[PDB]
Amino acid sequence: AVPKIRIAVPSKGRISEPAIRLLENAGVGLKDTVNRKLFSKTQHPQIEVMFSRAADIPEFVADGAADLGITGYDLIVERGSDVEILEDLKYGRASLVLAAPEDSTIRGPEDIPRGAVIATEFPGITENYLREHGIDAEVVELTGSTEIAPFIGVADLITDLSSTGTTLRMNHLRVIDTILESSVKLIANRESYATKSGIIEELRTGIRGVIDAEGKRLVMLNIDRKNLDRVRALMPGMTGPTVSEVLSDNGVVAVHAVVDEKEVFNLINRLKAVGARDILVVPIERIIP
Amino acid sequence: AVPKIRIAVPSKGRISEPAIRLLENAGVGLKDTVNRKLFSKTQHPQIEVMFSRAADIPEFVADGAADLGITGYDLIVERGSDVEILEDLKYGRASLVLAAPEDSTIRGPEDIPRGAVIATEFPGITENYLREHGIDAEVVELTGSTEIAPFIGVADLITDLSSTGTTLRMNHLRVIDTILESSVKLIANRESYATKSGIIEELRTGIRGVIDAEGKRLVMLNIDRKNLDRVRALMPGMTGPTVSEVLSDNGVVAVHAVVDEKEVFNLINRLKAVGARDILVVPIERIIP
Amino acid sequence: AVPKIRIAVPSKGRISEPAIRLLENAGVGLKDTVNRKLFSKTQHPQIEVMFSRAADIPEFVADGAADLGITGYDLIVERGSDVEILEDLKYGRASLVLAAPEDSTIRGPEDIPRGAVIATEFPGITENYLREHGIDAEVVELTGSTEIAPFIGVADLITDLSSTGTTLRMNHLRVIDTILESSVKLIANRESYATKSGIIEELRTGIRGVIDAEGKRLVMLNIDRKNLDRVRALMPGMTGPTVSEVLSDNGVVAVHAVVDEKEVFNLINRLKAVGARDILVVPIERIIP
Amino acid sequence: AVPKIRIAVPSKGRISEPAIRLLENAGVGLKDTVRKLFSKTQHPQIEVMFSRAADIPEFVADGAADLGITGYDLIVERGSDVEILEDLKYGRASLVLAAPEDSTIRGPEDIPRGAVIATEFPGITENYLREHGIDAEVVELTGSTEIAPFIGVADLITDLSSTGTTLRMNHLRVIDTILESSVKLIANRESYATKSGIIEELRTGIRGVIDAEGKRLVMLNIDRKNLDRVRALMPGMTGPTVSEVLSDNGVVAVHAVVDEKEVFNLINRLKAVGARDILVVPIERIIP
Amino acid sequence: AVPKIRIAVPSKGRISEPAIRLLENAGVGLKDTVRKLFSKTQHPQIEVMFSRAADIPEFVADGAADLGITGYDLIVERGSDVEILEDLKYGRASLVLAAPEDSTIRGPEDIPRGAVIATEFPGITENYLREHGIDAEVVELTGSTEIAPFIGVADLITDLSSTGTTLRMNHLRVIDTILESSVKLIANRESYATKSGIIEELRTGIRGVIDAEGKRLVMLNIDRKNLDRVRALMPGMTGPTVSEVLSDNGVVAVHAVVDEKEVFNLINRLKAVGARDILVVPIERIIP
Amino acid sequence: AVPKIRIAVPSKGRISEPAIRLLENAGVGLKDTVRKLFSKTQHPQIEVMFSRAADIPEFVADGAADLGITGYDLIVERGSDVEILEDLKYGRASLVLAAPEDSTIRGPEDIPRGAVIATEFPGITENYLREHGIDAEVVELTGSTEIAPFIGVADLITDLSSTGTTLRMNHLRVIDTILESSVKLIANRESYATKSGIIEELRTGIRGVIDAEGKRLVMLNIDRKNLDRVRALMPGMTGPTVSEVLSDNGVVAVHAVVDEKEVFNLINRLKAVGARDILVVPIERIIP
Ligand SMILES: N[C@@H](Cc1c[nH]c[nH+]1)C(=O)O
Ligand SMILES: N[C@@H](Cc1c[nH]c[nH+]1)C(=O)O
Ligand SMILES: N[C@@H](Cc1c[nH]c[nH+]1)C(=O)O
Ligand SMILES: N[C@@H](Cc1c[nH]c[nH+]1)C(=O)O
Ligand SMILES: N[C@@H](Cc1c[nH]c[nH+]1)C(=O)O
Ligand SMILES: N[C@@H](Cc1c[nH]c[nH+]1)C(=O)O
Ligand SMILES: [Cl-]
Ligand SMILES: [Cl-]
Ligand SMILES: [Cl-]
Ligand SMILES: [Cl-]
Ligand SMILES: [Cl-]
Ligand SMILES: [Cl-]
Ligand SMILES: [Cl-]
Ligand SMILES: [Cl-]
Ligand SMILES: [Cl-]
Ligand SMILES: [Cl-]
Ligand SMILES: [Cl-]
Ligand SMILES: [Cl-]
Ligand SMILES: [Cl-]
Ligand SMILES: [Cl-]
Ligand SMILES: [Cl-]
Ligand SMILES: [Cl-]
Ligand SMILES: [Cl-]
Ligand SMILES: [Cl-]
Ligand SMILES: [Cl-]
Ligand SMILES: [Cl-]
Ligand SMILES: [Cl-]
Ligand SMILES: [Cl-]
Ligand SMILES: [Cl-]
Ligand SMILES: [Cl-]
Ligand SMILES: [Cl-]
Ligand SMILES: [Cl-]
Ligand SMILES: [Cl-]
Ligand SMILES: [Mg+2]
Ligand SMILES: [Mg+2]
Ligand SMILES: [Mg+2]
Ligand SMILES: [Mg+2]
Ligand SMILES: [Mg+2]
Ligand SMILES: [Mg+2]
Ligand SMILES: [Mg+2]
Ligand SMILES: [Mg+2]
Ligand SMILES: [Mg+2]
Ligand SMILES: [Mg+2]
Ligand SMILES: [Mg+2]
Ligand SMILES: [Mg+2]
Ligand SMILES: [Mg+2]
Ligand SMILES: [Mg+2]
Ligand SMILES: [Mg+2]
Ligand SMILES: [Mg+2]
Ligand SMILES: [Mg+2]
Ligand SMILES: [Mg+2]
Ligand SMILES: [Mg+2]
Ligand SMILES: [Mg+2]
Ligand SMILES: [Mg+2]
Ligand SMILES: [Mg+2]
Ligand SMILES: [Mg+2]
Ligand SMILES: [Mg+2]
Ligand SMILES: [Mg+2]
Ligand SMILES: [Mg+2]
Ligand SMILES: [Mg+2]
């Protein structure tokens, strides 16, 4: 009769909570989720959530155990899983870098000698990076804590996943190359997409809408009509500022416009200097241009 | 002089966090909550919160240790506590079902023989269900994990609490009846209500308001005036769409209406096809019709 | 070229999460925060977050390891750290009280004898309180659980941090004085402020804006024009209610005003009695008057 | 052919780790546990089922487990038809009836009609009022009965203590003892009559461990001329064991079973009589 | 001068605490651990590096650790060039191939072309299909292979069990055994040829502990006139030890090494022959 | 009548479980603990109060606890007026003064005026600068002093290590040792003069455990004709114990106290001299 979809959402780690929050904002929040449950209903009667570990999501989606998944690009690439990437989700960004003991000769990938050992949690991506750059080096897979590998003599070099070079400087390591830029993606099974594109695009519009709302707020203010002109030039908004009557002693209007977070501080000072008062910043859940 | 109320809120489990979020949205968020504290102030000077385990809340409220409580209907029924139910809170929904090993003869309650053993966490509800259906069966109370009871030979049948039949299919069990539909309730002591109805109805209005806001968003768009008519028919809203001037090159208006989440996706496509742009979905915390 | 700032934010305890939420609401939410990271980027390219324990934040800020910090006033005072207080953050309020075994002679600080022992987690503040009140009493520093100290014979009196006297009454203790009122503060290094005041005031405006939004919501309603006058007197708002056209059968207008949470319940009943319908309470993230 | 037995063991709480340690000491330790739900042991005929202690009385009576290890309080609360085989001499606790210290009630006889008692053991409590002829309500809590008076849920509580210190902190006074609890080894009656051999083998091991508690083997070197005075000082189970030591003098080695209670005084006595090199060596099991 | 050795020990999982207990029993316990990443032991020449069990085979082969303690399954999965020194007789588990119970597949020979097997050991599995000549896909999971058929990720799973009970719960049937696992003590080849003395010293300690498992010293008092029948009843490692007891009769004390398996029957035999005061005393290490 | 004593024991950290194990080995283990705040022990006259290790020095000096078990570093930091009774030979750690590896400072004498030292032991540090005559600031942190230079909070740190490995990871170099720490048994002076009997009884038990560390009872079977060479090979505490074995030849059993350090060499010696069936049996306590 009517098709259901299952979306694979990380159960633990950094990706998990923001993925739950995004679905919530997309109108597809978790519904009546009992604990000890691997599956959960959502606010949409045709969408369920499967809690899966993040490294398994590429495969679950490739195989069709889940129609859609939310996971990291690094994991998708490492598995080499056969999946369609639908959207970049603009969170969970991290670089898989190649790093060396700061006192090392090696200052760039050109310096890596035949016998060099590299410790990694991502042997697939790392072998591939080495193969593409033609470097002959050995790759040792570790469970974690690659940062310790030079210290204990397992490796000359490491790979590592970071937003800030800080955990690297702390272990006295220097980035000598970036192997991969990673971000969280919404992915899809191909067979699922061809047969269930309505509901899929429905969730995709909801999610895509939340992403376009990022760093966008609705700014409202009361202005005396004599200054309404300078407020136009300051708040162009999406098509133009929305202007409404205010019941007061002066000819006061209320002006609303969607504004980006990059612009709000300079705008506030520019608005106040023109006679704007009662400046409100109201949240926007979804934008569809 | 002036009356204080104490509301019992679950401390752990699935009910806990959403109850805290609901009070927050009702204007009664937790205020300055020190850890290791069994009590907490709220944003309202006359409302305090007592952190109680969910199964104890019916009794705390029945006895008057708490004026009000937020807990599950199953727990209220199981205890048979003497309390007034004020509101259904529309979350934490779950069915207490009667289930059998999938390969069993028993396909419905009619098939249960004299000597049948049923394992449960809810002996009260279960005895009562059996008594009302006239079935002679034995009831064994377990601490948890009733799903394992047939496997280890303790029981022929089990009861279980689920939103999805998934944890049941996983243990190879089939639902042969639904015993009780459960949902989270706001409850009240009777003596508390008669003597403190002002503040109680105040919290009740706040909470009731958050529940009516569920699946309701405020949708805003910019439309060229030539198409303002088709937007009326698409966005009836609560009384009618709110229309405001936009300062642009064309006669553009801005149109706002409260819309239900069931309708937003079809609405978006219907709006875009009519010339609507810059579609915003803004959250609504409380609705009072 | 351009200056970066580092803000010290508590990593564990009651202060932590609300501090993260406040920055989020200020437009400076945590960005791409990898776990096991002591530092994190934020939504602002010039602002980073250092996760620090709350008692260490005064010193980190005094010394310049962090430009700014969010921590409790009690901790700032106890350390006696040299820092500039920028804003009170209006959460995490607690009183450091002096308390005695309820059956004790001591009913006020005047009754404390020469040899009296006071157990505390705040010896600095406590010595200082004693020194200012001229009382000769001994101060014993404990790791925690000062509430047990009279019971085991370590102390006659204790200090304690509470929003509610409940944890004190439970251990059968009575407050005999308040030593210090504590609240969460935004603080700053002096050298950081003189050299990086632009970006600092930018974050300060963002944060200050979120604090002024507390207990303030945007209330919207549909009213028939014949009753628009009584709605003026009920919703003065910031300058005056914003009034917009509604496309319906009657001359209906829509009226919006910023209202304080203290007034919403009485307002709702007053609005309904005048013919107001479809009352919406919409959240406001930031107010800049 | 070969009867196998299942023993229900607590999976969490304070009964768990000591019960597991008890089986280990009895020669039937957890073998290659992948803790879990079912574990193998050193004995081919014995398997452990990890269970919630409150459920163990039921699992045993219904036959899902041949044997169990759980608290007497839980056995009585369930009302489960099980055979108590052995007292395990640990997890002792009294289920007491308690009143607020500022209460007039000092004993069962002071409890007025309609008093409310908060408890985790509603079956035990209702029965206690019916054996004593007291007309009072019973209210069941998940835990923290200590806090019920303070919040106004009950006038009285029951609680489970071995030291009255939790009660003393929360300003509560013991007015009676309802039941004395200790961890028991229990048996399914049908399992016993059909598998007595293997049950008795584990029973003996388990009983041997309990009978070794606080017992030590004391060993010392002494010159031959003082051997007569050691004799009196430590009688042991039957008498002290003697062996020749190879050294310069006529040194002998003397060993005996001694109780912890005796050891300090005994050491002093032995030292004053010329004994040196005194060893205390553990005994896992004793069978008299 | 003085060679020092590093032994990689699992920092979490079920291999961890028993390995640490094993070193303690071998006279090389963790000393003043501030557990950590590197710890001192009772032996000046020995230091522990806490490591993830999956990494230990690599740390050992590459030379970052002279010795390790990790599962055979992990050693084979890594394919690490290490020397297995000793079997440690714990953490036994079979890596089995399993099918849904409602599956037609009962054996390796029933596996149809293109069947999908979910596993945590993709190297072991791929090799198993290549030693048996089976054309099937392999899919690697982080864990919970038991759930893969139910969700439709695979037709078959591998799993690691000592009791088939997890499999029985999730309605799965064992169709073959791929590998039998046990915890091993492993060595770097270069470390052995250069530090054999200290390695063999720890090896002996460790081997002595394993050879003591399930062995006890049984001790009893008996009258001299029955000493002949004890002899037959417990042969011990060579024969029972006898010493004079000081009491009233002609009482002697008799001691022997006995296996746990024997102890119950033996106790009965000894009791029927007049032996009393029977003690079971632990043995930490045995070296024949 | 009957004096009772309270002993403050750490409730968490690395001092906790070994202290509890120490009391158990001393014949005064935790009895029926419902861990808690107050526990009973095997001794009627002894009760345990679980406490934070940092508070134990105060609880003892002020008299809330007669005895305690806590780190020397914490005792000195408090400046608490307590009697140290016994060294407990575990939880050893040095409080070191450390500099960034890329620092010019190699010793105390290199520390320039106004240098900032981050520490968890501000009392110990301030005193160290005043015993050495160094003009430097002290900044107190909750923990993670290792990270203070990297973030720019201090030029120097103090830290508490037994292996310099945490320091080596965070690129820090030890420049001096401020204090050497070990876990102590401490006493209230007033408690000692009034309850010396019971205190000394626990002291002896506790001291007996520490003196047993690394000591074992070695036992072996040998033919009578080789008994002379065993004598030389293991002198024991006074000399080896000998008993007749019942077998076919003239076999005797020989036992002695031996140190862990000796055991490997000794085993080899005994094997070469014809000794077989070598047992290592634990000793809980030794009193010379
Ligand atoms: N007219 C304003 C606000 C708005 C957008 N859409 C609806 N209203 C803008 O274009 O930015
Ligand atoms: N006039 C719109 C929006 C609104 C409701 N209330 C206030 N404004 C509607 O009725 O849906
Ligand atoms: N005019 C309304 C709402 C508003 C404030 N600022 C912009 N709009 C008020 O002053 O309360
Ligand atoms: N003969 C000693 C030791 C012993 C008991 N049983 C066997 N040996 C005693 O009776 O105490
Ligand atoms: N002589 C006894 C005990 C023993 C073994 N080795 C040393 N002593 C036996 O052979 O079993
Ligand atoms: N006689 C042996 C064993 C022993 C010590 N003390 C008592 N027995 C030795 O001196 O080493
Ligand atoms: Cl990596
Ligand atoms: Cl980087
Ligand atoms: Cl990308
Ligand atoms: Cl579809
Ligand atoms: Cl149930
Ligand atoms: Cl269902
Ligand atoms: Cl309902
Ligand atoms: Cl009221
Ligand atoms: Cl305090
Ligand atoms: Cl207060
Ligand atoms: Cl203040
Ligand atoms: Cl600046
Ligand atoms: Cl339980
Ligand atoms: Cl109770
Ligand atoms: Cl209950
Ligand atoms: Cl009492
Ligand atoms: Cl049998
Ligand atoms: Cl691992
Ligand atoms: Cl597997
Ligand atoms: Cl993987
Ligand atoms: Cl099977
Ligand atoms: Cl060597
Ligand atoms: Cl501490
Ligand atoms: Cl330190
Ligand atoms: Cl501090
Ligand atoms: Cl160093
Ligand atoms: Cl005494
Ligand atoms: Mg939702
Ligand atoms: Mg493709
Ligand atoms: Mg990393
Ligand atoms: Mg590159
Ligand atoms: Mg709030
Ligand atoms: Mg009613
Ligand atoms: Mg359930
Ligand atoms: Mg029905
Ligand atoms: Mg953010
Ligand atoms: Mg200043
Ligand atoms: Mg406090
Ligand atoms: Mg005052
Ligand atoms: Mg336990
Ligand atoms: Mg369990
Ligand atoms: Mg349990
Ligand atoms: Mg009642
Ligand atoms: Mg209790
Ligand atoms: Mg382990
Ligand atoms: Mg590890
Ligand atoms: Mg591990
Ligand atoms: Mg595949
Ligand atoms: Mg598994
Ligand atoms: Mg510890
Ligand atoms: Mg503690
Ligand atoms: Mg502690
Ligand atoms: Mg300073
Ligand atoms: Mg440190």
Crossing angle of the two packed helices E260-272 and D196-210, in degrees rounded to 10? 90
Contact C242, A249 (CB under 8 A): no
Contact B61, B9 (CB under 8 A): no
Tokens of B214: 């569920």
Q: How far apart are CA C28 and CA C207, in angstroms?
A: 9
Which of D237, D259, D263 to probe ligand 4 with, by most ligand atoms within 8 A of CB? Answer: D237
Q: How far apart are CA A257 and CA A259, in angstroms?
A: 6
| Ligand having the closest approach to the CA of A56 | 26
Closest CA to D146 of E98, F34, A54: F34
- Please work out whether the CB of residue B280 comes within 6 Å of at least one atom of ligand 1: yes
Instruction: Give the Cβ contact number of residue E31 at 10 Å.
Output: 18
What backbone phi and psi angles, to 5 degrees, belong to B249? -70, -40
Domain boundaries, chain F: 1-90+182-214, 91-181, 215-288
For Cα atoms D199, D205, D208, give the angle at the middle one, nearest 5 degrees. Answer: 135
Cross-chain residue pair B172–E171, CB shorter than 8 Å: yes
> Which residues fall within 8 angstroms of residue D195, CB to CB, at 6 or more apart?
D3, D5, D66
Using a CB-CB cut-off of 8 Å, the residues of chain C touching A268 are 205, 288
Tokens of C4: 């970066």
Q: How far apart are CA C18 and CA C24, in angstroms?
A: 10
First and final CA of chain A: distance in angstroms? 33
- Count how many residues are written for chain F: 288
Residue E50 host element (H or E): strand E46-51
Q: How far apart are CA D266 and CA D270, in angstroms?
A: 6
Q: How far apart are CA F94 and CA F128, in angstroms?
A: 14
Q: How far apart are CA F138 and CA F136, in angstroms?
A: 7
Q: What is the largest CA-CA distance in chain E?
A: 82
DSSP 8-state symbol, D20 = H
Strand pairing partners for B49? Answer: B7, B40
Helix and strand numbers (H, E) in chain D are 10, 17
Q: How far apart are CA B173 and CA C154, in angstroms?
A: 59
Q: Count of alpha carbons within 13 Å of D204, Cβ hemisphere only?
A: 19
Cross-chain residue pair C286–A278, CB shorter than 8 Å: no
Q: How far apart are CA C255 and CA C279, in angstroms?
A: 10
Tokens of D73: 């309080």
Please identify which residue in the block is written with the tokens 């679905």: A23
Indicate contact of A with B: 3+ CB pairs under 8 A: yes
Q: Which of D22, D23, D32 to mutate to test the interface with E (most CBs of E within 10 A)?
A: D32
How far is C-alpha F266 from the chain's CA centre?
A: 28
Contact B176, B60 (CB under 8 A): no
Which of E211, E218, E231, E237 to probe ligand 5 with, by most ligand atoms within 8 A of CB? Answer: E237
Cross-chain residue pair C65–F141, CB shorter than 8 Å: no
Q: How far apart are CA E162 and CA D36, in angstroms?
A: 11
Closest CA to D37 of E165, E93, B141, B101: E165
Q: How far apart are CA A116 and CA A176, in angstroms?
A: 14
> Which residues fall within 8 angstroms of residue D265, CB to CB, at 6 or more apart?
none
Q: How far apart are CA B6 and CA B42, in angstroms?
A: 10
E91 φ/ψ sector (left φ>0, alpha ψ -120 to 50, else beta): left
Contact F198, F46 (CB under 8 A): yes
Tokens of C162: 């509470």
Ligand 1 atom with the shortest distance to the CA of B280:
6
What are the C-alpha distances in Å from B91 to residues B21, B22, B161, B216, F162?
12, 10, 14, 16, 54
How far is C-alpha C183 from the chain's CA centre?
A: 5
Q: Domain A1-91+183-215 carries which CATH code?
A: 3.40.190.10
Q: How far apart are CA A160 and CA C36, in angstroms?
A: 12
Strands (DSSP E) found in chain A: 5-10, 30-31, 39-42, 47-52, 68-72, 84-88, 94-101, 117-120, 138-141, 157-162, 173-182, 184-188, 216-224, 242-246, 252-260, 277-283, 286-288
Indicate contact of F with B: 3+ CB pairs under 8 A: no
Closest CA to D154 of D106, D110, D97: D97
Cross-chain residue pair E32–F245, CB shorter than 8 Å: no
Q: Domain E215-288 carries which CATH code?
A: 3.30.70.120
Ligand 4 atom with the shortest distance to the CA of D239:
10
Q: What is the DSSP string of F228-272?
A: HHHHHH---SS--EEEEE-SSS-EEEEEEEEEHHHHHHHHHHHHH
Q: How far apart are CA E104 and CA E111, in angstroms?
A: 9
Whether domain E1-90+182-214 has CATH 3.50.50.60: the reply is no
Cross-chain residue pair C280–B282, CB shorter than 8 Å: no
Q: How far apart are CA B247 and CA E152, in angstroms?
A: 56
Which of E255, E262, E281, E283 to probe ligand 5 with, by most ligand atoms within 8 A of CB? Answer: E255
Chains touching B, CB cut-off 8 Å, 3+ pairs = A, C, D, E
What backbone phi and psi angles, to 5 degrees, belong to E142? -70, -25
Contact A217, A282 (CB under 8 A): yes
Count Cβ atoms within 10 A of the Cβ of residue B54 and give its class: 0-12 exposed, 13-18 middle, 19 or more buried: buried
Q: Which of C103, C158, C172 to mutate to test the interface with D (most CBs of D within 10 A)?
A: C172
Contact D227, F221 (CB under 8 A): no
> Which residues fall within 8 angstroms of residue E142, CB to CB, at 6 or more apart?
A53, A55, A56, E120
What are the C-alpha distances in Å from E16 to residues B136, B144, E22?
51, 30, 10
CA-based radius of gyration for chain C: 25
Closest CA to B111 of B132, B138, B135: B135
For residue C244, the distance in angstroms to the closest alpha carbon of chain D comes to 52
Instruction: Give the Cβ contact number of residue F276 at 10 Å.
Output: 15
Q: How far apart are CA B11 and CA B33, in angstroms?
A: 13
Cross-chain residue pair D243–F241, CB shorter than 8 Å: yes
CA C209 – ligand 3 centroid, Å: 15
For residue C202, the distance in angstroms to the closest alpha carbon of chain A comes to 6
Contact B63, D139 (CB under 8 A): yes
What backbone phi and psi angles, to 5 degrees, belong to A172? 55, 60
Residue C222 host element (H or E): strand C216-224
CATH architecture label of D91-181: 3-Layer(aba) Sandwich (3.40)
β pairing state of B47-52 and B5-10: parallel
Q: How far apart are CA B259 and CA B263, in angstroms?
A: 7
For C103-119, give one letter per residue: b (16+ CB within 10 A) or e: eeebeebeebeeebbbb
E25: helix, coil or strand? helix
Among E54, E64, E152, whose Cβ lies nearest the Cβ of A143? E54
Q: How far apart are CA F160 and CA F54, in angstroms?
A: 15
Cross-chain residue pair E286–F278, CB shorter than 8 Å: yes
Q: How far apart are CA D248 and CA E193, in angstroms?
A: 44
Q: How far apart are CA C86 and CA C71, in angstroms?
A: 12
Position C173, amino acid:
L
DSSP 8-state symbol, C80 = T
Chains touching C, CB cut-off 8 Å, 3+ pairs = A, B, D, F
- Please work out whether the CB of residue C257 comes within 6 Å of at least one atom of ligand 3: yes
Closest residue of chain C to B27, computed from CA coordinates: C261
Residue D98 host element (H or E): strand D93-100
Whether domain B92-182 has CATH 3.40.50.300: the reply is no
β pairing state of A5-10 and A68-72: parallel
Closest residue of chain F to A103, computed from CA coordinates: F102
For residue C110, the distance in angstroms to the closest alpha carbon of chain B comes to 29
Ligand 6 atom with the shortest distance to the CA of F235:
11
For residue A247, the distance in angstroms to the closest alpha carbon of chain C comes to 5
Q: How far apart are CA C43 and CA D41, in angstroms?
A: 57
Could you tell me the resolution of this structure in angstroms? Answer: 2.5
> Which residues fall within 8 angstroms of residue B17, CB to CB, at 6 or more apart?
none
Q: How far apart are CA F100 and CA F111, in angstroms?
A: 13
Check if D1-90+182-214 and D91-181 are the same fold: yes
Helix boundaries (H) for chain F: 16-25, 56-62, 72-78, 122-132, 148-151, 165-169, 189-194, 196-210, 227-233, 260-272
Residue A266 host element (H or E): helix A264-272
Q: How far apart are CA D114 and CA C174, in angstroms?
A: 32
For F12-42, give one letter per residue: b (16+ CB within 10 A) or e: eebbbebbbebbebbbbbbbbbbebbbbbbb
Strand pairing partners for B221? Answer: B255
What backbone phi and psi angles, to 5 degrees, belong to E92? -65, 140
Contact E15, E92 (CB under 8 A): no
For residue D45, the distance in angstroms to the closest alpha carbon of chain E comes to 11
- Please work out whether the CB of residue B257 comes within 6 Å of at least one atom of ligand 2: yes
The class that CATH gives domain C216-289 is alpha beta
Q: How far apart are CA F119 and CA F138, in angstroms?
A: 7
Q: How far apart are CA D172 and CA D99, in angstroms?
A: 5
C134 φ/ψ sector (left φ>0, alpha ψ -120 to 50, else beta): left
Q: How far apart are CA B207 and CA B215, in angstroms?
A: 15
Q: Which of B166, B274, B280, B285 to mutate to test the interface with A (most CBs of A within 10 A)?
A: B280
Cross-chain residue pair B143–D49, CB shorter than 8 Å: no
Crossing angle of the two packed helices E196-210 and E16-25, in degrees rounded to 10? 100
Residue B117 host element (H or E): strand B117-120
Q: How far apart are CA E128 and CA E178, in angstroms?
A: 7
Instruction: Give the Cβ contact number of residue A197 at 10 Å.
Output: 13
Q: How far apart are CA E32 and CA E46, in angstroms?
A: 13
Q: How far apart are CA C196 and CA C209, in angstroms?
A: 20
Q: How far apart are CA E143 and CA A62, in angstroms?
A: 18
Closest residue of chain B to D141, computed from CA coordinates: B56
CA A236 – ligand 1 centroid, Å: 9
Please identify which residue in the block is written with the tokens 């009983």: D207
Using a CB-CB cut-off of 8 Å, the residues of chain C touching F54 are 143
Using a CB-CB cut-off of 8 Å, the residues of chain B touching E150 are 169-170
Contact E269, D270 (CB under 8 A): no
Q: Count of alpha carbons within 13 Å of E84, Cβ hemisphere only?
A: 16
Q: How far apart are CA A99 and CA A113, in angstroms?
A: 15
Please identify which residue in the block is written with the tokens 């014995």: D46
- Please work out whether the CB of residue E65 comes within 6 Å of at least one atom of ligand 5: no
Which of A220, A244, A248 to probe ligand 3 with, by most ligand atoms within 8 A of CB? Answer: A220
How far is C-alpha D182 from the chain's CA centre?
A: 5
Question: Dihedral of the CA atoms F122, F123, F128, F134 (nearest 10)?
Answer: 60
3-state helix, strand, coil in chain D (%, to 5): 35, 35, 35
What are the C-alpha distances in Å from A10 to residues A54, A162, B15, B23?
5, 19, 22, 28
Count Cβ atoms within 10 A of the Cβ of residue B124 and give its class: 0-12 exposed, 13-18 middle, 19 or more buried: middle
D91 φ/ψ sector (left φ>0, alpha ψ -120 to 50, else beta): left
As residues whose CB is below 5 A from the ion ligand 55, the structure lists: E 159
Q: What is the largest CA-CA distance in chain F?
A: 82
Using a CB-CB cut-off of 8 Å, the residues of chain F touching C60 are 151, 153
